[PDB]
Assembly symmetry: C5
Homo-oligomer: 199 residues x 5
């Protein structure tokens, strides 16, 4: 239980063993969720990489925020992948918030405070509870994250825009699954903790 | 009679059966009108779709706000179509207000608070009163079943309709989110009937 | 004598008979002048059209503000034409003010409050007094205006920039030839009076 | 001695005889200087023209601010020319301030309040005192448009000072003062209120 | 010990002998550092040049901020070089701050107040203390233009701190202080008021 406020994990160079493991005190399977985070990297234009990986015994790609080169963002929950295209890539810290709701299969994807069209994905699904959450790696390094990532947070329900807007503006949020202000992690490899570059 | 304030219909995926039906307490035929709405979608650059469909038995295209790919907006009242070209399309929630006045055939088309040149269309014509208003789908057969190739995928809301031509000042206000008092289709007191894969979620645009 | 304040003439569709005729209480020949107006149309990119036509018995093109496609603005006084080029045309209401001074032949051309280089055109001449001023059509004993035009005003002397700036900002002015606040016109054809679209 | 404040010379059409002559009460040769002015024209994209011409008996191009088409600004003092390139030309009134200092040969060139890299030119030189300063002409290149707010100091203005002049702050020139100009017109050139603020 | 506040070294023309030598009262080897400076030049698009050169007996390129044409910025400490690419070059005064930390080999590179992705370079390593710091030269690589506001700390500045320095806030360097610089000029290089604000 550490307060990562104002700090961020940084992955200096391409590796095959460096990654961060977040431990979520999960007890109930997810029927909806929302994860937000900040990440800054220069890979975008050259190759792909993993931002957020959430895997279960039965499914290694239960919930995964990925960036496939020359295409855009790839949000995938429960093996099924959906794509949020992005034509012109810009090098700069970016903040994202994505959410999925089983009851309707509506997935939202917010980038830098602005929302992308809503979409449908994995209706009537159910995300496993006991899982292994990892930052910087793909549960292979050709998909490794090189740069900084931080301010990751996760709620077990779908945040409303107003709420999302606030989080972006750096307003007070109360996560209930993954809280940056009280994170329980386990580092491994060449990854450090330094003050965050984005405001 | 529901207050849809701060909410919006969302059409997640391409369908052939999903659509929303608005019920207007119409009694007199329209001699002029104004309809405004908010819609956000990603189709624009790939295919066309229907924004607002108002059809009468005698006429399937009484009043219809459509988006024909690679061209722009297609406003059509009473079968006759007029085009409001738009070269560079930008992905983002957009708000539109269009109005037609029989006595002159002058149709206005406001986009995001800014107006496009005035035009002439179906002067003298008269819009039927008893009609079927639908959101998200293209009435091409006043009977039932539709053809997805023109379906709306995304969110649409804040639709409102007056039986007279709104003045710019008024239109400006509506855009800024000021109070107004529609008299045909009121978002604050909407009477609808959903059908298919369409939900009600908080609106994304401010 | 009507107060056209906050209103504008609108020419809905292409015609060969629609036009507006302004009546100026002229008694002395012009030795200098300034005319300002607001007009919004979509023709610009396709064909040419007449904005302001002022013709005399001896000369039908005494003073005429025209828009020749793919070139720019064509200001012409007394048969002689001068050109104010405009490369990239933008669809939006535009406000213009142009002025000519016999004593020097210096013609100014202001667009949306900003001025274009000064030019020389007909020095010594004297514009006729008794004339027929028309809006929307081209006087000549195909090139009709389709859209809205309003806020036309005319002084018998050259307005200073400061003055011009004010007019643009919507500040009080006192025209002495053609006053929008006390216009005396005569419509003819398919042309209506509706509230102006530009602020 | 006239106060040209708020006014500007305007050259309506291309001529071969129109120009303005400024008279400087010079007595000592220049060992450094700074000249600023406002000029608005449409030639830029088509041909070249002379902005400021300062010539001496032995040298007709003692100090000259010129605009060579498709290249940029050409500042030249004492016959030697230096170039301040400008790729994308934009039609709009522009204000410039350029200065040269013999002791180092460092020439500054400010455009619309922003400075261009410093450069070296004619170090050790010494500009003649008795000269003929002309606006609009080259002592094919005539200036067509308006030019005004010309001022000249016999020393190098500091950035702060230059910044002020641009913002329209009070400046006390000591060679060529717009507020107390002594000129002599000739040709088709008039005096009208300035277009730029 | 001079207060170079509001002034800058200017290298007017390409030379093979002109340069500035900074003297640092170093006594302990560096285990981390941060250097910031302002430089304005027109070379960028044509050739390469040296911004900051710090060399030791053991390694003449102990720490060097360089600009390799058509590529971007080249930060190199202890011989090992790393590259901070920059596609579209823009002519204008630029301010940079770069820092390296032995304990992790994390090098930061801030340009005009904005940071570039972090990188790893020379870990464990120890920069020599007794060195020769030079500005404008490489201990077809000479700097032509102005350079100033150089400062150096023996520890890694935090973003907040860096942000402040950029905004012109008060800072307390402990290795190279612009407000109390001890230098030695040599060649055609002068001291003039800085062009950038």
């Amino acid at each position: 239980q550490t307060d990562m406020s104002r700090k961020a994990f940084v992955f200096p160079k391409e590796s095959d063993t460096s990654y961060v493991s977040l431990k979520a005190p999960l007890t109930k399977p997810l029927k909806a969720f929302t994860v937000c985070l900040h990440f800054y990297t220069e890979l975008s234009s050259t190759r792909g990489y993993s931002i957020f990986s959430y895997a279960t015994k039965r499914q290694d790609n239960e919930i995964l925020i990925f960036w496939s080169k020359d295409i855009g963002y790839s949000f995938t929950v429960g093996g099924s992948e959906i794509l949020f295209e992005v034509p012109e890539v810009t090098v700069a810290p970016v903040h994202i918030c994505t959410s999925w709701e089983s009851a309707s299969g509506i997935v939202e994807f917010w980038v830098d405070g602005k929302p992308r069209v809503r979409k449908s994905l994995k209706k009537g699904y159910t995300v496993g509870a006991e899982a292994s959450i990892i930052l910087g790696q793909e549960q292979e390094g050709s998909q490794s994250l090189v740069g900084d990532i931080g301010n990751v947070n996760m709620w077990d329900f779908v945040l409303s825009p107003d709420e999302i807007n606030t989080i972006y503006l750096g307003g007070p949020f109360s996560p209930n699954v993954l809280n940056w202000r009280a994170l329980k992690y386990e580092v491994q490899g060449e990854v450090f903790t330094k003050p965050q570059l984005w405001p």
